[PDB]
Amino acid sequence: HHWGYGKHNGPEHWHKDFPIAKGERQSPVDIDTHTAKYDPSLKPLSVSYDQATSLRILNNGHAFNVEFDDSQDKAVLKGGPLDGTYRLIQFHFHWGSLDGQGSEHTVDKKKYAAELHLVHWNTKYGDFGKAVQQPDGLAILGIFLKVGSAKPGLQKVVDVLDSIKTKGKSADFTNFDPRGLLPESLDYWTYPGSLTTPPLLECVTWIVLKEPISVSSEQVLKFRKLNFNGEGEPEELMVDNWRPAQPLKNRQIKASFK
Ligand SMILES: [Zn+2]
Numbered sequence: 430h431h432w433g434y435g436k437h438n439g440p441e442h443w444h445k446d447f448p449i450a451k452g453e454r455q456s457p458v459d460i461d462t463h464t465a466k467y468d469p470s471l472k473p474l475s476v477s478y479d480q481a482t483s484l485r486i487l488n489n490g491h492a493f494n495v496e497f498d499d500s501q502d503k504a505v506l507k508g509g510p511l512d513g514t515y516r517l518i519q520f521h522f523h524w525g526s527l528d529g530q531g532s533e534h535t536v537d538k539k540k541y542a543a544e545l546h547l548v549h550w551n552t553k554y555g556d557f558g559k560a561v562q563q564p565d566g567l568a569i570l571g572i573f574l575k576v577g578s579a580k581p582g583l584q585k586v587v588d589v590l591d592s593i594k595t596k597g598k599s600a601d602f603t604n605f606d607p608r609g610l611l612p613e614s615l616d617y618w619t620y621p622g623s624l625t626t627p628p629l630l631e632c633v634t635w636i637v638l639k640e641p642i643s644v645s646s647e648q649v650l651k652f653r654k655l656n657f658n659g660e661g662e663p664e665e666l667m668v669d670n671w672r673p674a675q676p677l678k679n680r681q682i683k684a685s686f687k
Pocket of ligand 1: 521522523546625
Protein backbone atom coordinates (compact mmCIF):
# COMPACT_ATOMS: atom_id res chain seq x y z
CA HIS A 430 0.00 0.00 0.00
CA HIS A 431 0.86 3.55 -0.92
CA TRP A 432 -1.93 5.50 0.80
CA GLY A 433 -1.05 8.92 2.15
CA TYR A 434 -2.06 12.57 2.20
CA GLY A 435 -0.46 13.74 -1.04
CA LYS A 436 -1.71 15.01 -4.29
CA HIS A 437 -2.61 11.51 -5.74
CA ASN A 438 -2.95 9.12 -2.77
CA GLY A 439 -4.96 11.11 -0.23
CA PRO A 440 -8.18 10.30 1.61
CA GLU A 441 -10.45 10.51 -1.39
CA HIS A 442 -8.49 7.57 -2.95
CA TRP A 443 -8.37 5.24 0.07
CA HIS A 444 -11.63 3.47 -0.81
CA LYS A 445 -10.00 1.69 -3.79
CA ASP A 446 -7.74 -0.38 -1.54
CA PHE A 447 -9.90 -0.15 1.60
CA PRO A 448 -13.58 -0.28 0.58
CA ILE A 449 -14.67 0.17 4.22
CA ALA A 450 -13.70 3.82 3.66
CA LYS A 451 -17.29 4.24 2.41
CA GLY A 452 -18.74 2.25 5.34
CA GLU A 453 -21.46 2.93 7.86
CA ARG A 454 -19.30 3.90 10.85
CA GLN A 455 -16.38 5.92 9.47
CA SER A 456 -14.37 8.54 11.35
CA PRO A 457 -13.77 11.37 11.82
CA VAL A 458 -17.11 13.19 11.84
CA ASP A 459 -18.34 16.71 12.38
CA ILE A 460 -19.68 17.19 15.91
CA ASP A 461 -22.80 19.39 15.71
CA THR A 462 -23.16 20.83 19.20
CA HIS A 463 -26.75 21.70 18.40
CA THR A 464 -27.80 18.11 17.79
CA ALA A 465 -25.52 16.11 20.12
CA LYS A 466 -27.67 15.23 23.08
CA TYR A 467 -26.69 15.05 26.74
CA ASP A 468 -26.79 11.43 27.90
CA PRO A 469 -27.29 11.17 31.69
CA SER A 470 -26.40 7.44 31.47
CA LEU A 471 -22.72 8.02 30.70
CA LYS A 472 -20.80 6.85 33.72
CA PRO A 473 -17.87 9.01 34.96
CA LEU A 474 -14.84 8.80 32.70
CA SER A 475 -11.54 7.48 34.28
CA VAL A 476 -8.08 8.19 32.89
CA SER A 477 -5.48 6.24 34.95
CA TYR A 478 -2.04 7.12 33.61
CA ASP A 479 0.02 7.28 36.87
CA GLN A 480 1.89 4.05 35.98
CA ALA A 481 2.29 4.68 32.25
CA THR A 482 5.54 3.45 30.73
CA SER A 483 6.46 5.14 27.48
CA LEU A 484 9.14 3.33 25.51
CA ARG A 485 9.86 4.78 22.10
CA ILE A 486 8.82 7.35 19.46
CA LEU A 487 8.51 6.27 15.81
CA ASN A 488 8.05 8.21 12.55
CA ASN A 489 5.89 5.74 10.59
CA GLY A 490 5.63 7.89 7.44
CA HIS A 491 2.09 9.03 8.31
CA ALA A 492 2.53 10.53 11.79
CA PHE A 493 4.73 9.76 14.78
CA ASN A 494 3.66 7.37 17.52
CA VAL A 495 4.71 7.61 21.16
CA GLU A 496 4.54 3.95 22.18
CA PHE A 497 3.80 2.49 25.61
CA ASP A 498 4.29 -0.84 27.41
CA ASP A 499 0.79 -2.43 27.09
CA SER A 500 1.68 -5.84 28.56
CA GLN A 501 0.04 -4.93 31.93
CA ASP A 502 -2.73 -2.50 33.09
CA LYS A 503 -0.31 0.40 33.50
CA ALA A 504 -2.17 3.18 31.68
CA VAL A 505 -5.86 2.52 31.29
CA LEU A 506 -9.04 4.20 30.23
CA LYS A 507 -12.29 3.16 31.92
CA GLY A 508 -15.74 4.60 32.54
CA GLY A 509 -17.39 7.08 30.29
CA PRO A 510 -19.28 5.13 27.64
CA LEU A 511 -17.00 2.12 28.09
CA ASP A 512 -17.51 -1.34 29.54
CA GLY A 513 -14.31 -2.89 30.85
CA THR A 514 -10.73 -1.74 30.66
CA TYR A 515 -8.77 -0.29 27.77
CA ARG A 516 -4.98 -0.14 27.79
CA LEU A 517 -2.95 2.67 26.27
CA ILE A 518 -0.77 1.45 23.38
CA GLN A 519 0.29 4.70 21.66
CA PHE A 520 -0.57 8.31 21.03
CA HIS A 521 -0.07 10.37 17.90
CA PHE A 522 -1.26 13.61 16.31
CA HIS A 523 -2.73 14.92 13.08
CA TRP A 524 -1.92 18.49 12.08
CA GLY A 525 -2.09 21.07 9.34
CA SER A 526 0.19 23.15 7.18
CA LEU A 527 -1.71 26.25 8.45
CA ASP A 528 -3.17 26.99 11.86
CA GLY A 529 -6.70 26.99 10.43
CA GLN A 530 -6.69 23.28 9.62
CA GLY A 531 -5.29 20.01 10.94
CA SER A 532 -7.91 18.36 13.09
CA GLU A 533 -9.85 15.30 11.95
CA HIS A 534 -12.99 15.82 13.97
CA THR A 535 -14.59 19.23 13.59
CA VAL A 536 -16.95 21.06 15.96
CA ASP A 537 -19.77 22.86 14.14
CA LYS A 538 -17.47 22.64 11.09
CA LYS A 539 -14.58 24.34 12.96
CA LYS A 540 -11.19 22.83 12.21
CA TYR A 541 -8.56 23.00 14.94
CA ALA A 542 -4.84 23.28 14.26
CA ALA A 543 -4.23 19.66 15.29
CA GLU A 544 -5.75 16.68 17.07
CA LEU A 545 -4.16 14.25 19.56
CA HIS A 546 -5.29 10.60 19.59
CA LEU A 547 -4.56 8.42 22.66
CA VAL A 548 -5.25 4.88 21.44
CA HIS A 549 -6.37 2.14 23.85
CA TRP A 550 -7.40 -1.50 23.29
CA ASN A 551 -9.97 -3.55 25.16
CA THR A 552 -8.19 -6.01 27.43
CA LYS A 553 -10.92 -8.63 26.94
CA TYR A 554 -9.46 -9.31 23.47
CA GLY A 555 -5.91 -9.99 24.68
CA ASP A 556 -3.91 -8.00 22.13
CA PHE A 557 -4.31 -5.03 19.82
CA GLY A 558 -4.44 -7.06 16.64
CA LYS A 559 -7.40 -9.10 17.92
CA ALA A 560 -9.07 -5.99 19.37
CA VAL A 561 -9.20 -4.16 16.03
CA GLN A 562 -11.34 -7.02 14.66
CA GLN A 563 -14.11 -6.25 17.18
CA PRO A 564 -16.68 -3.43 17.15
CA ASP A 565 -15.77 -2.54 20.75
CA GLY A 566 -12.07 -3.24 20.41
CA LEU A 567 -10.57 0.24 20.79
CA ALA A 568 -11.25 3.42 22.73
CA ILE A 569 -9.59 6.53 21.28
CA LEU A 570 -9.43 9.72 23.35
CA GLY A 571 -9.29 12.69 20.97
CA ILE A 572 -8.08 16.11 22.11
CA PHE A 573 -8.09 19.25 19.97
CA LEU A 574 -5.06 21.58 19.77
CA LYS A 575 -5.28 25.31 19.15
CA VAL A 576 -2.32 27.67 18.67
CA GLY A 577 -1.79 30.07 21.59
CA SER A 578 0.26 29.54 24.69
CA ALA A 579 2.81 26.74 24.79
CA LYS A 580 1.94 23.37 26.33
CA PRO A 581 4.84 22.62 28.63
CA GLY A 582 3.99 18.94 28.76
CA LEU A 583 4.42 18.68 24.97
CA GLN A 584 7.93 20.12 24.81
CA LYS A 585 9.78 16.85 25.40
CA VAL A 586 7.95 15.44 22.34
CA VAL A 587 8.84 18.53 20.28
CA ASP A 588 12.48 18.32 21.19
CA VAL A 589 12.94 14.68 20.06
CA LEU A 590 11.42 15.23 16.61
CA ASP A 591 14.77 16.16 15.01
CA SER A 592 15.93 12.64 15.78
CA ILE A 593 13.00 11.03 13.98
CA LYS A 594 12.73 13.39 11.02
CA THR A 595 12.13 10.73 8.36
CA LYS A 596 10.01 7.62 7.83
CA GLY A 597 11.23 4.57 9.73
CA LYS A 598 13.33 6.38 12.32
CA SER A 599 12.71 5.73 15.99
CA ALA A 600 14.23 6.97 19.24
CA ASP A 601 14.12 5.89 22.84
CA PHE A 602 11.42 7.84 24.61
CA THR A 603 11.05 6.68 28.23
CA ASN A 604 9.42 8.33 31.21
CA PHE A 605 7.04 10.57 29.25
CA ASP A 606 3.91 11.48 31.15
CA PRO A 607 0.81 11.72 28.88
CA ARG A 608 -1.11 13.49 31.69
CA GLY A 609 0.75 16.61 30.58
CA LEU A 610 -1.27 16.59 27.34
CA LEU A 611 -4.74 16.68 28.92
CA PRO A 612 -6.94 19.79 29.26
CA GLU A 613 -8.51 20.69 32.61
CA SER A 614 -11.96 19.28 31.86
CA LEU A 615 -12.77 15.71 30.85
CA ASP A 616 -16.20 16.65 29.44
CA TYR A 617 -16.61 14.77 26.15
CA TRP A 618 -18.64 13.69 23.17
CA THR A 619 -18.81 10.03 22.21
CA TYR A 620 -19.92 8.01 19.19
CA PRO A 621 -19.03 4.69 17.49
CA GLY A 622 -16.59 4.88 14.59
CA SER A 623 -13.39 3.80 12.97
CA LEU A 624 -9.67 4.14 12.67
CA THR A 625 -8.97 7.31 10.67
CA THR A 626 -6.10 5.72 8.72
CA PRO A 627 -6.10 2.51 6.66
CA PRO A 628 -7.26 -0.13 7.39
CA LEU A 629 -10.13 2.13 8.58
CA LEU A 630 -11.60 -0.65 10.73
CA GLU A 631 -14.91 0.07 12.48
CA CYS A 632 -13.65 -0.91 15.91
CA VAL A 633 -13.54 2.38 17.87
CA THR A 634 -15.52 3.97 20.67
CA TRP A 635 -14.53 7.62 20.12
CA ILE A 636 -14.29 9.91 23.14
CA VAL A 637 -13.58 13.48 21.98
CA LEU A 638 -12.88 16.06 24.71
CA LYS A 639 -14.75 19.34 24.52
CA GLU A 640 -11.88 21.48 25.84
CA PRO A 641 -8.90 21.95 23.53
CA ILE A 642 -5.31 22.27 24.72
CA SER A 643 -3.16 25.22 23.62
CA VAL A 644 0.25 24.74 21.97
CA SER A 645 2.56 27.49 20.77
CA SER A 646 3.24 28.45 17.20
CA GLU A 647 6.86 27.32 17.75
CA GLN A 648 5.70 23.87 18.89
CA VAL A 649 3.48 23.33 15.81
CA LEU A 650 6.17 24.69 13.53
CA LYS A 651 8.44 21.87 14.74
CA PHE A 652 5.82 19.28 13.88
CA ARG A 653 5.71 20.76 10.41
CA LYS A 654 9.45 20.07 9.96
CA LEU A 655 8.91 16.32 10.07
CA ASN A 656 9.04 14.38 6.78
CA PHE A 657 6.73 11.81 5.22
CA ASN A 658 9.66 10.48 3.18
CA GLY A 659 12.54 8.30 4.20
CA GLU A 660 16.11 9.48 4.62
CA GLY A 661 17.81 10.12 1.31
CA GLU A 662 14.53 10.62 -0.49
CA PRO A 663 13.01 13.87 -1.78
CA GLU A 664 11.77 15.98 1.11
CA GLU A 665 8.02 15.94 1.67
CA LEU A 666 6.98 17.83 4.77
CA MET A 667 4.69 15.87 7.10
CA VAL A 668 1.77 18.31 7.12
CA ASP A 669 -1.96 17.95 6.49
CA ASN A 670 -1.95 14.35 7.70
CA TRP A 671 -5.67 14.48 8.52
CA ARG A 672 -8.72 12.73 7.08
CA PRO A 673 -11.73 15.03 6.61
CA ALA A 674 -15.11 14.47 8.22
CA GLN A 675 -17.14 11.49 7.00
CA PRO A 676 -20.93 11.03 6.85
CA LEU A 677 -22.53 10.41 10.23
CA LYS A 678 -25.12 8.02 8.78
CA ASN A 679 -27.09 6.03 11.34
CA ARG A 680 -25.23 7.30 14.41
CA GLN A 681 -25.84 9.69 17.27
CA ILE A 682 -23.21 11.75 19.04
CA LYS A 683 -23.80 11.81 22.82
CA ALA A 684 -22.54 14.46 25.21
CA SER A 685 -21.33 13.78 28.76
CA PHE A 686 -22.25 17.34 29.83
CA LYS A 687 -25.28 19.60 29.81
ZN1 LIG B 1 -5.20 9.40 14.71
